[PDB]
Design a protein around this ligand. Structure first.
Ligand SMILES: *[C@@H]1O[C@H](CO)[C@@H](O)[C@H](O)[C@H]1NC(C)=O
Length: 278
């Protein structure tokens, strides 16, 4: 029988970041399919991430949504989370290319523009929060595994963990919740609108991206949404994962995984439930 496979899309429109686009389209789609953008980490690739999170493609088969795997061949295969272009709405670079991949997909498959989501690990988690801050008009939910608060690397000469200024990855950058909220506002000056629901994950033993970044991400998004922790669930979804539920639970939740390092493995069902797809 025919089987869907990951395939590179060689022309998806304008590509300011000079990125690759790969797509997994199930053989049977929902009538108005959702789109999940799945973002690899540094030194990774679209094909690598397709293998790294093995439960995503079967979930697409079961639910009839489309997976878009962008790929970066620049800066140690890291996503640009440092330049003004990538960090800003309509600015350019990788984030605009990713949005163009989304628009290509919505147009070709008559997809549901209200059901575009993004998930990523490490560098890809960092980019997922860039997409949340700079393109909240495109994305309705994000799931960031082992990343860094939006804007931490603003101005940096690169976005990999090998640059000279490694203050963010080393956990040395602490800003107030208000400062992190104002950072998010800088992604789209004058925008006073919604932001996609944000789910963040980090491991307490991460030697690459300090778990201090989890605390900074919590400050950032609790300020954006104006929420505080209302409930904590132990061992949720797995032993040692502490789930922090903020407000009424509809905008921001966070998971700190005891003993886990770089990166927290993707919990597909937790992320799909967050996106409302299951
Ligand atoms: C956006 O919100 C700020 C307060 O955060 C306010 O000063 C500004 O007037 C608002 N923009 C518009 C167009 O109303």
């Amino acid at each position: 029988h025919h089987h869907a496979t990951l395939s590179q899309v060689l022309d998806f429109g304008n590509n300011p970041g000079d990125n690759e686009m790969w797509i997994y389209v199930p053989d049977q789609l929902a009538a108005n399919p959702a789109v999940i953008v799945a973002l690899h980490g540094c030194l990774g690739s679209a094909e690598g991430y397709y293998s790294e999170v093995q439960d995503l493609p079967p979930a697409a088969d079961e639910n009839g949504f489309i997976l878009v795997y962008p790929g970066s061949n620049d800066d140690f295969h890291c996503w640009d989370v440092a330049t003004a272009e990538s960090l800003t709405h309509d600015g350019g670079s990788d984030s605009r290319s990713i949005v163009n991949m989304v628009q290509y997909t919505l147009d070709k498959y008559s997809g549901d523009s209200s059901k575009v989501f993004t998930t990523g690990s490490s560098s890809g988690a960092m980019m997922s929060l860039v997409l949340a801050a700079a393109y909240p008009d495109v994305f309705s939910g994000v799931a960031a595994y082992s990343g860094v608060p939006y804007g931490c690397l603003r101005g940096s000469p690169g976005s990999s963990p090998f640059t000279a200024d490694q203050a963010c990855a080393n956990g040395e950058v602490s800003r107030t919740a208000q400062e992190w909220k104002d950072e998010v506002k800088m992604a789209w000056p004058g925008y006073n609108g919604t932001y996609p629901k944000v789910q963040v994950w980090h491991g307490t033993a991460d030697s690459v991206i300090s778990p201090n970044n989890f605390d900074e991400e919590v400050k950032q998004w609790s300020a954006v949404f104006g929420v505080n922790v209302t409930k904590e669930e132990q061992d949720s979804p797995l032993d040692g994962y502490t789930r922090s539920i903020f407000g009424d639970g509809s905008h921001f939740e966070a998971y700190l995984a005891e003993g886990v390092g770089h990166v927290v493995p993707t919990q597909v069902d937790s992320t799909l439930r967050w996106f409302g797809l299951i």
